[PDB]
Amino acid sequence: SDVKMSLSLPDKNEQVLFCRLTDEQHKVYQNFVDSKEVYRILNGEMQIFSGLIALRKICNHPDLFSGEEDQFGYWKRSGKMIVVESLLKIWHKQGQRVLLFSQSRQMLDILEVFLRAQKYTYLKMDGTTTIASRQPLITRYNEDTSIFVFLLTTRVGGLGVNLTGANRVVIYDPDWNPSTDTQARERAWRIGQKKQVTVYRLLTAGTIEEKIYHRQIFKQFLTNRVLKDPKQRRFFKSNDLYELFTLTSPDASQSTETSAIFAGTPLASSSLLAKMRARNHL
Amino acid sequence: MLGFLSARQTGLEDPLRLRRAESTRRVLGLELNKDRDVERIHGGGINTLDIEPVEGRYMLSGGSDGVIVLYDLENSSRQSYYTCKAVCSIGRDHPDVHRYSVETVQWYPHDTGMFTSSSFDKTLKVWDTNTLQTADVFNFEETVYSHHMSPVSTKHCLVAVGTRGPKVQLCDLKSGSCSHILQGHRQEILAVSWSPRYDYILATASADSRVKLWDVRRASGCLITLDQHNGKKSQAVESANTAHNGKVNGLCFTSDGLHLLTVGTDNRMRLWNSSNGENTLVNYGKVCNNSKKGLKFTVSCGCSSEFVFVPYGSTIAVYTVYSGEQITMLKGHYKTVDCCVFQSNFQELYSGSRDCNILAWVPSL
């Protein structure tokens, strides 16, 4: 903000798409949130962490949790993959270049198989690639235009690997850390970025992913309150933010939970005493 | 005295000569003035006294009964006999009065409008003298033995607080941060004293027989650990480098801040080079203290030779700092003397004691 006038910065826009669950995916999610496993989680007899991983897998794609046109990872069975279909098609018709981010490497491979089912040229870099060959791939993506979509997880590579030739970026699934998603969006939009970059975060409304995004915003708010300004308008509820084993998918009659929450948008011993009493009345 | 007056009048001697010599003579002639009294207000023993640094008119006093008394030390009556009346008092009915013994009380340096006081109720309260109300309270996890504000720092307004914890708490009265801790002691810190010379030098004495000098700016521990022997008994520093052979319950920088006086429950007082912590090997004889808490003792200021007034049982032992020669013992109390404070303007002493009295010692003639 203060140093902006010294260096240039292209404008950045960002949207949070709320992707409805497919009916089979919705049934699987509801069966899991009604199955005895989440009941044992609520009893504390089992680790809640496995249930979290399971629901994140469900919202990514049922084939992860469950395990022609019926092969592994068919994109028609998860709504987020429907939106990725639409966005990838439109962006390819626009001639832009895409970064495809996802925290899960298994769903990253599912997305690869999906891209192969389509005719999009692409390049993948993840943790399985050798580090000594990471720099070439990035360069080959950045120098030409004959590669369309580059596949990442949010946490691979050195911090801020130079992916500049990309124009659009989609974060397939939110993470618990706000910083990894902020780094994901920052990686495309760095110094020396030629064109306006936009980030699309893919969420499933009423699911675990919406609560992951809510936690991400809450942590970001905490960091901002500590680091830039304490006075801050309060957004959240203690019980709603922490309870994250329910399913209330919107029917479009009522607005989504995020929009409902974001509905509005030497000292002379007298200065010393004045400051002490000021701080104490608060 | 007539030779001194003539030498001042004729310019043979600097007037500094007459000031320092006559002040020294008055201190040597210091004696219990029954021609002056301090109004008895404490129901318990006085643990601490503090005369304000500017104008030296008002004095604070904190008792074991948890009350604070604010006295006027000026003879506002026209008689030669007067009682130092109690101007104000945090009594048993004040809503902010300390629940337990007030162990230390200190005027805010640079101005008389604020003073801070610490107690065994695990609080350091900051009081506005004018309203006589607390402006801030610093709660600590364990009982406070001593607090001290730097008499010299125009920049920082930290209060060094020594409690039973092994850590020294630094509380910033400028916007409130009581998180900073100086770690390196192993037992209760019984005394803390900022150097009058350096804004950021703090000497802390603890029941682990060690005195450490810290540079509170520094992030790497104590500058120096006082050593009785200076290297004759040298060991990898894990248990050696003790300032005393018992608990060190009292600290006092000399007037210029170039030396440090520490008194410990080994019945010794030692004088240390405050720059390199080297023992000066001043003898002082045997200085009887068996105090289980901090022992507040003072030095003289603005005399030809510096003096130290140390509580010696029920008496106040007066010694020459740089030679160790015991000048005298001021004997007027009935129980152990806990604190003495020096009025440098007139070479007067005030001593509190467990007999719930504050005795003024004035120079005779």
- DSSP code per residue over chain A: --STTTS----EEEEEEE-PPPHHHHHHHHHHHHSHHHHHHHHTSS-HHHHHHHHHHHHH-HHHHH----STT-GGG-HHHHHHHHHHHHHHHHT--EEEE-S-HHHHHHHHHHHHHTT--EEE--TTS-GGGHHHHHHHHHH-SS--EEEE-TT-SSTT----S--EEEE-S--S-HHHHHHHHHHHS-TT--S-EEEEEEE-TTSHHHHHHHHHHHHHHHHHHHHT-S-------HHHHH---------SSS--HHHHHT------SSHHHHHHHHHHH-
Task: Note whether B157 contacts A272, CB cutoff 8 Å.
Answer: yes
Which residues of chain B are within 8 Å of residue A268 when distances are taken between CB atoms?
110-111
Positive or negative: CA dihedral B64, B65, B67, B72: negative
What residues of A are in the B interface, CB distance below 8 Å? 266-270, 272-273, 275-277, 279-280
The upper half-sphere exposure of residue A4, i.e. CA atoms within 13 Å in the direction of its Cβ, equals 5
The DSSP code for B12 is S
**Which chain B residue lies closest to A268 (C-alpha atoms)?**
B111
Helix (H) / strand (E) element for B260: namely: strand B259-264
Q: Are A261 and B103 in contact (CB under 8 A)?
A: no
CB atoms within 10 A of CB B311: 26
CA dist B228 and B264 (Å) reads 12
**Which chain B residue lies closest to A271 (C-alpha atoms)?**
B174
Task: Note whether A279 contacts B126, CB cutoff 8 Å.
Answer: no
The DSSP code for B177 is B
**Which chain A residue lies closest to B155 (C-alpha atoms)?**
A266
SS3 B10: helix
Q: Are B48 and B104 in contact (CB under 8 A)?
A: yes
Burial class (CB in 10 A: 0-12, 13-18, 19+), A31: exposed
How many angstroms is the resolution?
2.8
Task: Note whether B136 contacts A276, CB cutoff 8 Å.
Answer: yes
Q: Are B119 and B101 in contact (CB under 8 A)?
A: yes
Cα B257-B180-B133 angle, rounded to 5 deg:
80
Task: Note whether B157 contacts A267, CB cutoff 8 Å.
Answer: yes
Closest partner residue to B111 among A269, A276, A277, by Cβ? A269
Q: At a CB cut-off of 8 Å and minimum separation 6, what does A244 contact?
A: A52, A208, A211
Burial class (CB in 10 A: 0-12, 13-18, 19+), A23: exposed
- Name the β-bridge partners of A18: A203
SS3 B165: coil
Which residues of chain B are within 8 Å of residue A276 when distances are taken between CB atoms?
126, 135-136, 173, 176
Q: How far is B262 from chain A (nearest CA, A)?
A: 29
Q: What are phi and psi of A29, to 5 degrees?
A: -65, -40
Task: Note whether B110 contacts A267, CB cutoff 8 Å.
Answer: yes
Structure tokens at B284: 């002082």
CA dist B232 and B284 (Å) reads 21
The crossing angle, in degrees rounded to 10, of helices A48-60 and A208-227 is 110
> Within B166-290, where are the H helices?
none
Task: Note whether A272 contacts B154, CB cutoff 8 Å.
Answer: no
Tell me the residue length of chain A.
Answer: 282
Q: How far is A221 from chain B (nearest CA, A)?
A: 23
Please choose, from the candidates B181, B188, B176, B174, the residue with its C-alpha nearest in 3D space to the C-alpha of residue B202. B181
CA dist B151 and B77 (Å) reads 32
**Which chain B residue lies closest to A266 (C-alpha atoms)?**
B154
- Tokens 């500590």 belong to A226
Structure tokens at B347: 């070479």
SS3 B103: strand
Q: Are B137 and B126 in contact (CB under 8 A)?
A: yes
Closest partner residue to B108 among A269, A275, A280, by Cβ? A269
Q: At a CB cut-off of 8 Å and minimum separation 6, what does A227 contact?
A: none
Task: Note whether A273 contacts B114, CB cutoff 8 Å.
Answer: yes
CA dist B227 and B233 (Å) reads 9
**Which chain A residue lies closest to B132 (C-alpha atoms)?**
A273
Q: At a CB cut-off of 8 Å and minimum separation 6, what does B119 contact?
A: B62, B66, B98, B99, B100, B101, B102, B103, B125, B143, B144
Q: How far is B138 from chain A (nearest CA, A)?
A: 11
Cβ pairs A/B, distance under 8 A: 38
Structure tokens at B26: 């008055």
CA dist A107 and A151 (Å) reads 11
Q: What are phi and psi of B351, to 5 degrees?
A: -125, 125
The upper half-sphere exposure of residue B210, i.e. CA atoms within 13 Å in the direction of its Cβ, equals 20
Q: At a CB cut-off of 8 Å and minimum separation 6, what does B229 contact?
A: B279
Q: Are B72 and B35 in contact (CB under 8 A)?
A: no
For this PDB entry, the determination method is cryo-EM
CA dihedral (B96, B100, B106, B111) in degrees, to 10, reads 10
CB atoms within 10 A of CB B63: 26
Q: Are B315 and B25 in contact (CB under 8 A)?
A: no
The DSSP code for B242 is -
Q: At a CB cut-off of 8 Å and minimum separation 6, what does B313 contact?
A: B288, B336, B337
Structure tokens at A99: 């970064």
Most B CBs within 10 Å: which of A272, A277, A280, A282, as the mutation test of the B interface?
A272
Q: What are phi and psi of B145, to 5 degrees?
A: -90, -30
